[PDB]
From a paper:
The 5-bladed fragment, however, did not form a 10-bladed propeller, even though it was dimeric, as observed in solution. Rather, the dimer adopted an unusual, asymmetric structure, hitherto unseen in natural proteins, in which one monomer formed the expected 5 blades of an incomplete propeller, while the other monomer formed only four blades and converted part of the N-terminal fifth blade to a helix, leaving the rest of this blade unstructured. The blades in one monomer were antiparallel to the blades in the other, as opposed to natural propellers, where the blades are always parallel. Thus, while the fold is clearly built of blades, it is not a propeller. As the stretch of sequence preceding the helix was not resolved in the structure, we analyzed the intactness of the crystallized protein and found that it had undergone partial trimming during crystallization. Instead, one monomer changes orientation, improving the geometry at one of the two interfaces, and compensates for the accumulated tension at the other interface by conversion of its N-terminal blade to a helix, thus also reducing to nine the number of blades that have to be accommodated in the structure. The change in its genetic information is not large, going from 2, 3, 4, or seven repeat units to 5, but it is certainly discontinuous and leads to the sudden emergence of a new form, which – as a stable, efficiently folded protein – is available for further evolution.
Numbering used by the authors:
A (entry chain B): 32 to 207
B (entry chain A): 7 to 205
Write the structure that this text describes.
Amino acid sequence: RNGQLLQTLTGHSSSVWGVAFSPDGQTIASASDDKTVKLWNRNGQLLQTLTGHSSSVWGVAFSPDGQTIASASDDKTVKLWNRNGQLLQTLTGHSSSVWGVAFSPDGQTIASASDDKTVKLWNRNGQLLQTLTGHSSSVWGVAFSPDGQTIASASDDKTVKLWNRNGQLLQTLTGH
Amino acid sequence: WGVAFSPDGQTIASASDDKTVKLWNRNGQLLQTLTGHSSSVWGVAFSPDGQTIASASDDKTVKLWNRNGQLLQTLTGHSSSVWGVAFSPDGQTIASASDDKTVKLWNRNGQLLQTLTGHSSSVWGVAFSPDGQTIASASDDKTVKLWNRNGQLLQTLTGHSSSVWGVAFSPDGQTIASASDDKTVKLWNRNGQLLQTLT
């Protein structure tokens, strides 16, 4: 199934988060060079353009059911979109570029990874639930455990950290 | 299944319904079409330098191509569908994982170097260690196996309760991560010992 967590546990600072494939494998989403996210099918047919961010989009993810898309931007926000292109929510609270984003397995929680050295957890109504503090540099990747109760973050500080939903730091994995 | 993106992030590959692999830029324009496979492509990988593409197919072959579309080699030797492909960190060795229960290792000039025999069911995934000397395979048989390049089996990592679909090494090469349909990720050392389970 989803390789985000393997990639966050073992991947490099340079791992690329601006392309995502839908869970059914039929749709590709790409953070494009024009402040949009574009969706296309495997034949190459353009399906949708997600317009709203005011600067570069760096991270994209699909919800586990494929119906919601999250985009992470240099504009310091995450935006949530329906696959028909409508903007559903803007998640405000990071203080710098947002590099990466992930959905929880149940689709109800969003995690974001920012240049501000934090991961933030959010619900779909756009409310901030938790801020995970401790990395000493920009956070480039984030993922959930398969049961959705542990969050993994990966940072330019060369560590991976494991956290629970109440913000407790469970483990730091060093040499990354 | 049948998608990849280049290490620099600027090229997206995807297997198409028509048995080709398409390469797109990040704006959804077509760059190249890789034509040659006679049935579905299940696995695509880019080499670390981003200059070579490997495709794994139901036609029992892996094809190697350059990024302007030219077929370079066809890797013939699996006896059933090839599900996964990986390149070694130096780009010189390719590993392929097949429904035939084997991993095969190949030079980028197409020669079969080794066949890694031991799994009792389909092999879904394969990875090289950062130093290129150890291969890990993830199988439907619920194990990850670790191998050297001479094809010798070094360890079998036992503990997942369902098929293992994904495997990778930590950046320092001393920890192996496995992901399974049992809804866990396990971390292991090279002596095959379980370090932790992530639910």
